[PDB]
Structure formats: structure tokens, C-alpha cells
Design a protein around this ligand. Structure first.
Ligand SMILES: Nc1nc2c(ncn2[C@@H]2O[C@H](COP(=O)(O)OP(=O)(O)OP(=O)(O)O)[C@@H](O)[C@H]2O)c(=O)[nH]1
Ligand SMILES: Nc1nc2c(ncn2[C@@H]2O[C@H](COP(=O)(O)OP(=O)(O)O)[C@@H](O)[C@H]2O)c(=O)[nH]1
Ligand SMILES: Nc1nc2c(ncn2[C@@H]2O[C@H](COP(=O)(O)OP(=O)(O)O)[C@@H](O)[C@H]2O)c(=O)[nH]1
Ligand SMILES: [Mg+2]
Lengths: 426, 439, 193, 48, 426, 48
């Protein structure tokens, strides 16, 4: 009906997508063998959106799995939900990109994209009515930042009348797991801002903070952080594959949250989050969900929203639940925090209501939000890039593969224009 | 329905033929007595022995070869040794006086009195076999019998049987060492016969076997009793497709047309690989690519020349063992990629393969290891003209002082054959450079 | 065995045969005859050879004088499938006749029934030397199968003495067959015999 | 580099040719519509 | 009834016809004993098309088995299906040819051609209403190419109003397993194009491409290669043996594929080829079958149809289905690939359907297509012949057996005139 | 040779795009003609 193609690049994109294909398989009641074992029939009426039918009742996921280093695909098949992925969808190279944007884009990631494009185009024609693309990667690496932005470029020039929903794991200063990623961050937002319509910035420091103070777990491994991300992955589009009373697809979110062709950088959220030891003492109510969507503690990006002003906010609700309490409290948070929203546009909040909550919960709410506090997210990368390009360091790895030094100046120039426009409209 | 006949000439021939036929005993399980072992009371397992061994109603298998030599001393060790009851009392022809390192003694004066005795048994072995492809000749250049008697044997065999195939395995003189002095005389004066009265002729050099056996098998100080095992390992991989089943079979007629592009150009070259010891066998994996690369390597080359200085005209693959055809094509397409190996521009397809299923067997006390796959080269290249050039230069400076002429003139032949044999070769070397010249 | 690798690994690897079994491994030869309905053209003695390397069976018929048929070879070094069918979509690896061949076992090869009648002397030496695999070559168990009828063991002496008319130690194989089947025990197999 | 550019430009050329064929099809169909309502013009002239 | 007489010459022809007579024995339910062991009854309504009836409910193949060396006759008679072939159907010689067309066509093949006529004319006259002939041989061999071309000219002179189709084995650009095969093949195709109605060019290297890439197998023995050849051999005469919605003979395919008497070179293919891991995840569907048809990977000839363009296309389908997506999807690939078809003739593609699919399968389809891209095969053997003949190479094997040099020049001149008119319809 | 092929294919692609633009311009022009004679239809219907 409205099919979404999922693309996975980089090691971070492969791990999150492996968690993403696990949650929606649990939501639709699909065992790791490939059959369907559920109770309600509503999980079967809308099944072609995320899964493809095969003979014998076997369901296969419509996804593309790409990475030059074949290290992570051995772990993907060895995981709990790894038998369902198609071996024709496992496209890999021979040598890793080595944390270099040059090798990931123009030398080693330049001949594998022919093989990636034929799998993507084959799965595109298999769909009945294509709805768009969602992709996951990391900006701080070589394969995900390199081939991800390459694949964004090559698909946008071939499918113009579609949408791109990018879930990018942006680097953090204190959780800096690389020393060269200022180069890769600046050289990927050049390709991101011109060929994407909706981009979700995810940080690791925000997720480590949430699992400490909100969930209260002392061992937050990557098998848990990807679960928090995968909740927002499955909650953004829950009105596309389930009934409700006020439905909203990804294009309706795009036209309600993107007023300008360059102001399309978001900040996600998910807020029925409780610890195990405090489940008994909390009332699961619409007022308590509304309270904890909007605080700075629950945002999945390392930015304080109170240092800036929101432009647009959208909330997607799930569950059998009222509407006056939704409309009053979304109006109440606008009236109380009047200084936290810009005054030149009214009704900044979009609401969508569904019918089916996820398994093991009563009601859910997914938060997405455009804000001008992403200036602090990109100002740090600016100062990192300027102080690092000033002495021309970490550069022979880039000029030894074909690119001139002028592209570094253009990436800083594009990004300086991006922080000019948000400050102008704040 | 298929049979093969071998003729081994000279002391070299009768000594390589002993190791050639003991391996033939071991591939078909023939005991030195001449039968199946008496522990096995029912036989006739497969008629692969019919091409090399005869059949008698008492159960005895008799080989289909003949041994000829003018020296009785090396012949009668077969009569005295372990295999006395296996070999026929008539199939080993004995002379009385040797040719003594000469050409005229083996050709005109002593070779005549036994050329009729062997031809009776050649005819006797010819009407036993219903279908005969041709005759294999195992002769030596430096021997008196291998030069003089052979130069009348191939001439008489060509008119005895017209279109029958004629293969030769010649013990070529080594370019550095030699056991004799007058071997250029014995080598040149038999080439006038062999260039017109032979179909194909592989050359074997002993000193290249000396270094290969030393540096690869890790056996220092070898002996002829193990070199003949290596040559006898070459003969089995050629006739493997005739006896044993394979993916595609190569005949004795198949490669004689695919390695001889001109009637004056009938000198291919043999090479065997892998040649490794038992200790070296289990450490190194033996892929099809890793055994076909050493074959084209001139270090493992079995005649002392260099194809890098020359250029190939034809090649022949003899794959025997656990081999699948997919990586055969990947190997030969990889061989066509290196520019170090150079082919001529007029034979763009220079490959013929042959596949055999059964891996080669090993002998007790042998040097080679138990191997699962092997490959044999039969390649024709122009680098033999490098060996011929340094052979005639030695011949010309030796003839300039007219040395050893009296050993040949007084035997009965005239001295005009010396000038003709030098000149006929000189036209042949002119033919060798003209085929190597491209357009 | 070549196509297992597509689900064993994402990228296939060449199948690895038994280097150990090829390294230690002679040939076990059995005498066989053809078994169908009563047809006069089919009285042919075949010999079956088990190779003990690649686990392979080859059947050949020797050429017989003044016979209307001359079949040099029946099978060429190819493995044998038992008659259990189930050719496609078999989840397990396929069943192949292992090296379990006695005297008297009718083996169904390629739809042709072959009755085993005799073994070569090397084969019977293998039978008696290797007995953990073959309980039918135990002398001790062979005589334990006869010890169950000690009540008739006294009568068996006069039964033998009736055949021993010339006071010799000298009896026929067919006679030693017919007393041991006139026991009518039904448990004396031909291999034990 | 030249081969990649040549293949991409050839694919774009084939796409442009297909779009030209589509434009011709639209021209033919809505030309038929134009003839239909031209006959309507003639009918209403006869009505006057 | 219309019965097919099989001709099987050469060592290569023997190795592919042994597999050919295996699968139709497997499909019709013929045990190696010779009887019938199956479940249904419609397998026996038309069994005389390939099998001759005798006493005891026994069927022998309607084939002649021809070779010059007798080594591979013991190979055929002792195979898995060696006791079904008639003992009198084996014709053998004593002195083999050994990769020489000249000995096979003038000296060695001149005597065995009379004995094998007496076999085939005795067999062919016993058929009630003989449909036609079929042949399997290799161009690179002494027996199949030297003497099989004598059989082609001779039975055409004796049975004029018939149909004969050849599964010819053309050489490969790199795999080439002879040194003198331009002398073996160019004079064969000089005698082939005059006296043949249909020619299927089957190449070995294309099978190596299929088994390694499409089926993902690592040890492709010749038994594995010959099944793919034998699959499309049985796949062209399916409607002859079984009822369907729209039947088609070899005569019906010939009158739709060849428009001119010298344009009769095809390029076969087979659809259901899928790798084992991808078997369970791929939906066996009619658009999926026709998607794998026209891909250049699937083809069994060493030619690229993108370099040339198609002229006629045949599709023979197996399995109970609707004719809708066979009709609709071939129109789509006719309309999408406007530049890959000739424009001087419409409706180039012929439809045939059969009710019974092969064993272990639900739907299947066979590709038969004339193309101009086979000129690349002829020009490649043209330059190899031209760069060999000018200096009288390998000539004493050929001019010493009777035939003169004017035969060689006419072998070129007929072939250059053949590819001259191949260019003109492009 | 590859440069010559790429430049010829680029010229052909530009020609095909130009022809597509011309076809779309014809589409728009007789769309304007269609709407003009539709206004004419309305006028003579008012006359009727
Ligand atoms: N490779 C190899 N070469 C051998 C062998 N036996 C002899 N030769 C060669 O034969 C040469 C000596 O000539 P012979 O073969 O002994 O002489 P002949 O053929 O008996 O002729 P006459 O001595 O005149 O009777 C030596 O130079 C060796 O190179 C052998 O067993 N293996
Ligand atoms: N939150 C989270 N971050 C991850 C995960 N896997 C990888 N990352 C991040 O990805 C970054 C490394 O990216 P890298 O694998 O080198 O990218 P690539 O080389 O292009 O594939 C690190 O900074 C990690 O923080 C995960 O499961 N969860
Ligand atoms: N596709 C295929 N080709 C084969 C097979 N067996 C042999 N060939 C080819 O046939 C050629 C040799 O043909 P040859 O035996 O000389 O033909 P003959 O002399 O007429 O019997 C080789 O180049 C092989 O590539 C087979 O089973 N399948
Ligand atoms: Mg001697």
C-alpha cells in the first residue's frame, strides 16, 4: 500500500537496523523463523509496508545491508533475528574504509554502489506504491558517512518525487570515539542538507544520560541504546500501518514540520519511559506523558532546547484515549511556554492519534521536533573544523585519494550559511 | 579395444623402462610374479590393464613392450632381478657387441643384424592388438644404440606402418655436463633421420632433472633409479586418460596435432609439477592455481632453456586427480594476463586440457609424496633454438680440426653426411627463426 | 554437498573431502547374482567391489564364453542410493549404502536386485578380523546360537554317525549344510555358517 | 571516468526518449479530446 | 503421433545427451530398469514421442549414439542410466580423429556414415508420423564436428521436408580447449548454415557464469553443467508431450523465430535458476520469472544483447497459471526496452504455455531468441581464423588429406557474407 | 574512442531532451487552444 525502503550503512547503521527489524517483528508477532504467530488480525491487514510476502507464508524484510568491512554482517546473521534477512540483500566489499571519508566515497565505496543500486532498484519495482526511503548510518565513520551520503545523492537524482528520512547518529564532544570525525561531519552535512527532506539527529551522550537518570540501569550496553532508538523508529510511522482517529503519514509530518527548504533538522523523543522499580508508583496518564515529552532530559540530541526557540513540534499518540485532554494540554504547553516558541507562527503543535499501542504497554507517544537549538550542535563542529584545518593536519589521507582542499572550504561555507539562517529566524 | 606399444632403445631406455613398468604394475596392482595376488581369488576388476598388459587363460598379464640394447650386461639384470617371471623371455632383445658411443657402429654394421629380429616381434605385437594408435620410443641421443640403431628403426617403421603415430622421448645431451666426448656427433647425425621419420619428440635433459630433484624434493645426491621414477611418473600422466576415466579424455592422437604446427617443428617440451617431498606436502596447500604456476615458471622447467627469452607456440594440460573445471578456466585466464609469459601473435588459442579422475599412486621407497592432484606440461617453444645454437657451436669447433672422423669413415659410411647433417640443421634453425618472426 | 554452503555461510567455500579417510584408505570384493522373475537370458554372475575410499561401489561382469551378452562393466565408480526414494526437498543429507554387506544380503542397486553369494579370501579375512562392525563373523556368537538346543545335541551325534558310514573324519559341505538346516532353528545365517 | 560518464549519460538519454514518447501519447489523446469538443462546437452552432 | 528422433554425436554430445535422456526418464517416471514407476496416468498418454515400446512393458530411447573412439562408449553404457539405451544403437569406430575436422569429414568419417545411416534409416522409417530430428555435437571435436556435419548434409539430402535443430557447442573466448578449433569450427558453420533450420548456440563459459553466480556453487562438475543444457532441451518440446492452453511444436517456434533462411542462430535461457539460500525467500511469481529472462547474466551464449539488438523472442511456459502476466509483462519489457528491439516488425515475441511443470517446481519458462549480437561470436572466431591462416599454420594436417585451399577461402567468404547480412538487419 | 562515444551520446541526450521540451511546449500551446475554444463553447451556449 505505502511501502518504505530501509537502507543500512556503516557499523552503527547495521546494529540499529538489526534492533529496528527486531522490534517491529515483535510488534507484528513474527518469530525469527519467518512465519507469523500472533493473536490479533490487525497486525496482518497492514503487513506489506515493512515486510514482503514469500511462498510458504514466509515473510522477509525489505531492507538493504551494506558495509565494506564484512565484520559486522557475521554478527548480524548470528543475532536473534538474523535468519530473516535475504542473502541477496547482504552486499559487501573487501576492505574497510579505515575511518576515511575519501576511501568510503571515491575509491572503495565508488564501485560497490553499482551493486547497491541494483538491489535497491529491484526492490523498488517490487513495491506496489512506493512511499519513500528511511536510512540509518553514522556521520563519524568512513563507510556510513561516506556511502550513506553517496547513496542519498544517487537515489535523489533518480527518484525525485519521494522523501528521505535520515536517522543520523551525530558525534558528541565528550564521547568522541574518533579523532578525524570533524572532517567527516562537515563533509557529510554538505551532502545531507541538499538531498534530504527530514533528518533526525541522535547522540550517544543523550542516550547514556537517559538510561542513567530515567531508566536507572547500571550497565547500559549497546543492546539497550539501540532499543531506545528503535522505539522512535517504529513510532514515527505507526499511523501508516494501523488504524486510528486522526491519521498522519510521513509526508504530512514533512509538510507540517519543514517550513523552509533548509530548516529540516529535527530532534526525536519517546516518553513512556520508566524504571523497573518505579512502575508501581506512577499513574500512566495523558498529563504525565505530556509532562515528560517536553523536558530537556528526554531529548535524544545533546542540545538544551531552552537556549533556543522551537519552530514546529509534532506528537504521535497511540492507544484508546480521549481528544480534549490532548488538545487542551498541547494548547497549555504553548501558552505556558510562550517564550519557548516563536511568535510569528501560531499552532506549532501537530497531533496524530492511533489505535494500537505496542506490546507490554498501555499508551505511547513519539516526539519529533524542529528547533533552533541545533545551532549549538553545529557550532562545536565549526570550531573543531576551523582549528583543525588551520594547520592542514589529518589532510594527506584526503588529498591522496582525489579531492582538492577547496571542498573543505566549501563545506565550512555551506554550514556557516546553515547557522546563519537559524539565528536570523530565531 | 585400446592398446599401447612401447619401444625402449639403449641403456637409457632399458633402465627408464624398468621404473616405467613397475609403476604400471602398481597402478593396476600387478605383482612382480605377473598376476593378481593369490589372496584375491576372483579378478578381472576393470579392463584398464588390457592396454598395457596382455591376457592369458591362466590369469597371467604380460606387458606389451619390447626392450632393445646392444649391451647384454644391463639387460640380464631384468632376467636376474625381481621381475624375471613378469617380463616375457622374448620381449627383451639382446645384442652381443655394443656400438661403443658411436653412430656408424650402431647404424651400418651392427644395427643391421638385429633390425630383423625386433621387427618380427614388433609385427607379433602388432597383430595381437585390435586397435593401435602408434608406438612410443624411449631412446637416447648420446648412446650408440639409441642413435645408430634408432636411425634405422624409425626409417624402417615408417614404411612398415604408414600412418601410425610415432612419439619419441629423447634423452637430450645436457648443455654443461656429459658422460661422453663424441656426443655431438651422435646427436647431429641422427637428427636427419628423426626430423622426417617422427611425428612428435619430447626432449629430456638429465642435468635439469638433477637440480630439480635436489632443490624441490630436498634430496641431495640423487641416483638414476629415482630419476626414472620421475620420468615414469610423466609417462603415466600422459596415458592416464586412455586407461582411466575422466571428465574429458585426451587421446594419443589429440595432442600430436595440437603441438606440431609445421612438419619441421615437432619438438615440444615436458614439465611436471608439483614435485615436493612428504614433509613439504602437508604444510603447503596444493591448489590448481599453485600447481599450474610452477609449470609456467622456468625454474621448474625440465629442459635447460628459458621461455622468457623465447616464445610459445602450443601447450598441453594434463590434469590428473581431484580437479574441478571451474578453477582450471580461472587459472588459464590468469596465465593469459601476465606479460612476462609471451605467446606468438598467430596462435591466440594455445591451450588443450585433459582431465583424469584418479589421483597418482606412489611407490614404496619413492621420493614423491602421496598427492591428490597433479599437472603435466607438453609445451612447444622456440627456446630450444638457444640450446641448438650452443650445441652446433661445439660441433663446428670440434669438426674444424677433423677429430674423430676416422672412427666413422672406415666403418663404411661416407664423409659427405657430416656436411649434410650440419647444413640440414642450419636450414632447420633458419626455419626456427622464421616461425618466431611475427608479421 | 556443494550447495550446503549457501546456508552454512553467506559466501560459499569449496567442499572439503575426507583427507584422513583418503590417506589411510583395500578393495572388498563380493560375488553376486541377478534376482528377478524367471527369465532364461538372465543367469549372470557379477562381482561387486567396495572401494573403502569415497565409499563407492562398482559392479562388473567378466566376459563369458559363448554367451549372448558381453557386459564389461555395470557401474563406473559411482555411489549407490538405497531404494527408499525421497529424492527432492529432503531436509537431511541423503542416505547412501554404507559398508554393511554380508553373505546372502539381497542388495537393491539401481532397481536391479543382486544376491550376494560368496566373498573373496581377502574379504573373508576382513570379515573375521573386524568383528565390532560385523557380529555375524563371531565364532563365539555363532556357537552360542547353536548352544540353545542342548537337548538335541545328543541326537545330533547319531545323526552325524548315520552320515559317517566309512568311519572317516570326512563329510561334505552340502551335508554339513543339510544337518544344520535340518535343525530347523532358522537363526543360522549364511555368513555365520 | 569516461566509461562511467558515458553510461550515466546513455541512461539519461534513454529516459529522455521514453519521456518524449509519453509526451507524444499525451498529445494524441488530448488531440482526440480537442476533436471531440470541436464537434461539440459544430453541434452548438447548429443549435444556434 | 509426432515423434522426435534424437541424434547424439561426439564425446561432448554423449556427455550432454546422457543427462538429456536422464531428466525425461526422471520426468516421465522411468526407473533405470526400464519400466514405469509413477503416480498419475497422463504421463503415459504421449510417451511414444521419445520412447519405443517393446515386450514386458519396456521403453527404450528413440536415439542413436554415435562416436569414433570407443573409450566413451563404455563410459555411456556403465553410467547411472546405462542399461536403458539399446545395445544395437551404439555405433563406434576404431581409429579416433583427435581434434581434427579434416579426418572426421573426409577420411575417417567417410565409412562410418554409411553404417549409421543404416541404423537411423531403419529407425526413422519405423516411426508412424515422424516430427523431426534433433542433434547434439561439439564444434571443437574431430567426431562431432567432422562427421556430424556429414550427417547434417546427408539426411537433409534424404529427408527434405523435415525439421532439424542442433544444440551446437561454440567455443569460448578464454576457456578454449583446442589450439586448432577455428579450423574445426569455421568450416563446420560453413556446412551448418546451409543445412539447418534451428541452431542453439550453447557455450561452456556461460554455464560457468550461471553456476558460480546465479546458483552459488563452488564445484561445478560436467554433470552439473549438463543438467542446465538438458533443462532447456526438455523445456522446448513441453507442449508437444502435454496438453495446454496454447500448444507449440518445434515447427511452430521455427516459423516465428527465423524470418530468413540464413538467420537461424538463437541464444537460449532458463528462468527458475535461483540459489539455494535464496530459494525460500524468493516469491515464485510470473513477473519474477520474466525478470530473470531478459537479463544478460542468464543467457547460455557468450554474447551481450546490449551490444546488439533482438529480432525475435520465444517464451515457452510450464505450469497451470493465468495467461495474464505472461501477456502483460512481455508487453512491458517490449515497451520499456524500446532501443533493444527491431522496429521494422511488430509483436516479435511468441507465447506458449503448458500445464505440467517439471518435478519439484511450480512454474518454469524457456527463452529462445534470435539476435544480431551473435555476430560478435562469429567475428571473434573470424579474427582468430584470419590471424592463423595467412601463414599456413597447422596446414599439413589439412592439405595432406585431399581438400584444397579454395575450400578454406570459401569457408571464409561464406562466413563474411553471412555476417555482412547480419549487419544489415541491425 | 571512449571520449568520442561519450561526446556523441551527450549530444544525442541533449537532442532528446530538446525534443521532449518541444513536445511539452506543444502540449502547453494546444492546452491554451483547448481552453480558448472551451470559452468559445461557453459563449455560444449563452447565445443558445
Ligand atoms: N635420465 C637417465 N639417463 C640415462 C639413464 N641411463 C643412461 N642414461 C643416459 O645414457 C647416456 C649413456 O649412453 P648409453 O645409453 O649408456 O649408451 P647405449 O644406448 O647403451 O649405446 P652403447 O653404449 O654404444 O651400447 C648417459 O649420458 C645418460 O645420460 C637413466 O637411467 N636415466
Ligand atoms: N549509540 C550507538 N552508537 C553506535 C553503535 N554502534 C556504533 N556506534 C557509534 O558509531 C561510531 C563509530 O562509527 P564507525 O563504525 O567507525 O562508522 P563506519 O566506519 O563508517 O562504519 C562510534 O562513535 C559509536 O559511538 C550502537 O549500537 N549504538
Ligand atoms: N558443455 C559441455 N561441454 C563439453 C562436455 N564434454 C566436453 N565438452 C567440450 O567439448 C570439447 C571437446 O570435444 P571432443 O571430445 O573433442 O568432441 P569429439 O571429438 O567430436 O568427440 C571441449 O572443448 C569441451 O569444452 C560437457 O559435458 N558439457
Ligand atoms: Mg647399448
Amino acid at each position: 500500500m505505502r511501502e518504505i525502503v530501509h537502507l543500512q550503512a556503516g557499523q552503527c547503521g547495521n546494529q540499529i537496523g538489526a534492533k529496528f527489524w527486531e522490534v517491529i517483528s515483535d510488534e507484528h508477532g513474527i518469530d525469527p523463523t519467518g512465519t507469523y504467530h500472533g493473536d490479533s488480525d490487525l497486525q496482518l491487514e497492514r503487513i506489506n509496508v515493512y515486510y514482503n510476502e514469500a511462498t510458504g507464508g514466509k515473510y522477509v524484510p525489505r531492507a538493504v545491508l551494506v558495509d565494506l568491512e564484512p565484520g559486522t554482517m557475521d554478527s548480524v546473521r548470528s543475532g536473534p533475528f538474523g535468519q530473516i534477512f535475504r542473502p541477496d540483500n547482504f552486499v559487501f566489499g573487501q576492505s574497510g574504509a579505515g575511518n576515511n571519508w575519501a576511501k568510503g566515497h571515491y575509491t572503495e565505496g565508488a564501485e560497490l554502489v553499482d551493486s547497491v543500486l541494483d538491489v535497491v532498484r529491484k526492490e523498488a519495482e517490487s513495491c506496489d506504491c512506493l512511499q519513500g526511503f528511511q536510512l540509518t548510518h553514522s556521520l563519524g565513520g568512513g563507510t556510513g558517512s561516506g556511502m550513506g551520503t553517496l547513496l542519498i545523492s544517487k537515489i535523489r537524482e533518480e527518484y525525485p518525487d519521494r522523501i528521505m528520512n535520515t536517522f543520523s547518529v551525530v558525534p558528541s564532544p565528550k564521547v568522541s570515539d574518533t579523532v578525524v570525525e570533524p572532517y567527516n561531519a562537515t563533509l557529510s552535512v554538505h551532502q545531507l542538507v541538499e538531498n534530504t527532506d527530514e533528518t533526525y539527529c541522535i547522540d550517544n551522550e543523550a542516550l547514556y544520560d537517559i538510561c542513567f537518570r530515567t531508566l536507572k540501569l547500571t550497565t547500559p550496553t549497546y543492546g539497550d541504546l539501540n532499543h531506545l532508538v528503535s522505539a522512535t523508529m517504529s513510532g514515527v510511522t505507526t499511523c501508516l500501518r494501523f488504524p486510528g482517529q486522526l491519521n498522519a503519514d510521513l509526508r504530512k509530518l514533512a509538510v507540517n514540520m519543514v517550513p523552509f527548504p533548509r530548516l529540516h533538522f529535527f530532534m526525536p523523543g519517546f516518553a513512556p519511559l520508566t524504571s523497573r522499580g518505579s512502575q508501581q508508583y506512577r499513574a500512566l496518564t495523558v498529563p504525565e506523558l505530556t509532562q515528560q515529552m517536553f523536558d530537556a532530559k528526554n531529548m535524544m540530541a545533546a542540545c538544551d532546547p531552552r537556549h533556543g526557540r522551537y519552530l514546529t513540534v509534532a506528537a504521535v499518540f497511540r492507544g484508546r484515549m480521549s481528544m480534549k485532554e490532548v488538545d487542551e494540554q498541547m494548547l497549555n504547553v504553548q501558552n505556558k511556554n510562550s517564550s519557548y516558541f516563536v511568535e510569528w507562527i501560531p499552532n506549532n503543535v501537530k497531533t496524530a492519534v492511533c489505535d494500537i499501542p505496542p506490546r507490554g504497554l498501555k499508551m505511547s507517544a513519539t516526539f519529533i521536533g524542529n528547533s533552533t537549538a541545533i545551532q549549538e550542535l553545529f557550532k562545536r563542529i565549526s570550531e573543531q573544523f576551523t582549528a583543525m584545518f588551520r594547520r592542514k593536519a589529518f589532510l594527506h589521507w584526503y588529498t591522496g585519494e582525489g579531492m582538492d582542499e577547496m571542498e573543505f572550504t566549501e563545506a565550512e561555507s555551506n554550514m556557516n550559511d546553515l547557522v546563519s539562517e537559524y539565528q536570523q529566524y530565531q | 579395444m585400446r592398446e599401447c606399444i612401447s619401444i625402449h632403445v639403449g641403456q637409457a631406455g632399458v633402465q627408464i623402462g624398468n621404473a616405467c613398468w613397475e609403476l604400471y604394475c602398481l597402478e593396476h596392482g600387478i605383482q612382480p610374479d605377473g598376476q593378481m595376488p593369490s589372496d584375491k581369488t576372483i579378478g578381472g576388476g576393470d579392463d584398464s590393464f588390457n592396454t598395457f598388459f596382455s591376457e592369458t587363460g591362466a590369469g597371467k598379464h604380460v606387458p606389451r613392450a619390447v626392450f632393445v640394447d646392444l649391451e647384454p650386461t644391463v639387460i640380464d639384470e631384468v632376467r636376474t632381478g625381481t621381475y624375471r617371471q613378469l617380463f616375457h623371455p622374448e620381449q627383451l632383445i639382446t645384442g652381443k657387441e655394443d656400438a661403443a658411443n658411436n653412430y656408424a657402429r650402431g647404424h651400418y654394421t651392427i644395427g643391421k643384424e638385429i633390425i630383423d629380429l625386433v621387427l618380427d616381434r614388433i609385427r607379433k605385437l602388432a597383430d595381437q592388438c585390435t586397435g593401435l594408435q602408434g608406438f612410443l620410443v624411449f631412446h637416447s641421443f648420446g648412446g650408440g644404440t639409441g642413435s645408430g640403431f634408432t636411425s634405422l628403426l624409425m626409417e624402417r617403421l615408417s614404411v612398415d606402418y604408414g600412418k601410425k603415430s610415432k612419439l619419441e622421448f629423447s634423452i637430450y645431451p645436457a648443455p654443461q655436463v656429459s658422460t661422453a666426448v663424441v656426443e655431438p656427433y651422435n646427436s647431429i647425425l641422427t637428427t636427419h633421420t628423426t626430423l622426417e621419420h617422427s611425428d612428435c619428440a619430447f626432449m629430456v635433459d638429465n642435468e635439469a632433472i638433477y637440480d630439480i630433484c635436489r632443490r624441490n624434493l630436498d634430496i641431495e645426491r640423487p641416483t638414476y633409479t629415482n630419476l626414472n621414477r620421475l620420468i615414469g611418473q610423466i609417462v603415466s600422466s600422459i596415458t592416464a586418460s586412455l586407461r582411466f576415466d575422466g571428465a574429458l579424455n585426451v587421446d594419443l592422437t589429440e595432442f600430436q596435432t595440437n603441438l606440431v604446427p609445421y612438419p619441421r617443428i615437432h619438438f615440444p617440451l615436458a614439465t611436471y609439477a608439483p614435485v615436493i617431498s612428504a614433509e613439504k606436502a602437508y604444510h603447503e596447500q596444493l591448489s590448481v592455481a599453485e600447481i599450474t604456476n610452477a609449470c609456467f615458471e622456468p625454474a621448474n622447467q625440465m629442459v635447460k632453456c628459458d621461455p622468457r627469452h623465447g616464445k610459445y607456440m602450443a601447450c598441453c594440460l594434463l590434469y590428473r586427480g581431484d580437479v574441478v573445471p571451474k578453477d582450471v578456466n580461472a587459472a588459464i585466464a590468469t596465465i593469459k594476463t601476465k606479460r612476462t609469459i609471451q605467446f606468438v601473435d598467430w596462435c591466440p588459442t594455445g591451450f588443450k586440457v585433459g582431465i583424469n579422475y584418479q589421483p597418482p599412486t606412489v611407490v614404496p621407497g619413492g621420493d614423491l609424496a602421496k598427492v591428490q592432484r597433479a599437472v603435466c606440461m607438453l609445451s612447444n617453444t622456440t627456446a630450444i633454438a638457444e640450446a641448438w645454437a650452443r650445441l652446433d657451436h661445439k660441433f663446428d669447433l670440434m669438426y674444424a680440426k677433423r677429430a674423430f672422423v676416422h672412427w666413422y669413415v672406415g666403418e663404411g659410411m661416407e664423409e659427405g653426411e657430416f656436411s649434410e647433417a650440419r647444413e640440414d640443421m642450419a636450414a632447420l634453425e633458419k626455419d626456427y627463426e622464421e616461425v618466431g618472426v611475427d608479421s | 554437498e556443494d550447495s550446503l554452503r549457501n546456508c552454512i555461510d553467506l559466501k560459499p567455500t569449496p567442499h572439503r573431502r575426507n583427507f584422513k579417510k583418503f590417506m589411510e584408505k583395500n578393495i572388498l570384493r563380493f560375488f553376486a547374482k541377478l534376482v528377478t522373475d524367471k527369465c532364461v537370458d538372465l543367469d549372470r554372475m557379477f562381482v561387486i567391489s567396495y572401494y573403502l575410499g569415497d565409499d563407492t561401489i562398482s559392479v562388473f561382469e567378466p566376459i563369458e564364453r559363448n554367451s549372448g551378452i558381453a557386459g564389461g562393466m555395470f557401474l563406473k565408480r559411482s555411489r549407490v542410493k538405497k531404494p527408499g526414494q525421497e529424492v527432492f526437498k529432503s531436509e537431511l543429507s541423503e542416505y547412501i549404502k554404507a559398508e554393511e554387506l554380508y553373505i546372502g544380503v539381497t542388495v537393491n542397486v539401481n532397481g536391479y536386485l543382486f544376491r550376494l553369494l560368496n566373498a573373496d579370501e581377502y574379504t573373508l579375512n576382513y570379515m573375521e578380523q573386524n568383528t565390532d562392525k560385523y557380529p555375524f563373523s563371531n565364532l563365539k556368537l555363532a556357537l552360542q546360537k547353536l548352544k540353545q538346543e542342548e537337548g538335541k545335541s545328543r541326537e545330533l551325534k547319531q545323526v552325524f554317525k548315520a552320515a559317517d558310514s566309512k568311519h572317516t573324519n570326512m563329510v561334505d559341505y552340502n551335508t554339513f549344510r543339510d544337518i544344520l538346516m535340518s535343525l530347523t532353528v532358522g537363526n543360522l545365517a549364511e555368513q555365520e555358517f | 571516468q569516461q566509461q562511467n560518464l558515458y553510461e550515466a549519460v546513455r541512461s539519461d538519454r534513454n529516459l529522455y526518449s521514453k519521456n518524449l514518447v509519453e509526451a507524444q501519447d499525451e498529445i494524441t489523446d488530448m488531440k482526440r479530446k480537442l476533436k471531440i469538443m470541436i464537434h461539440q462546437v459544430d453541434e452548438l452552432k447548429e443549435d444556434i
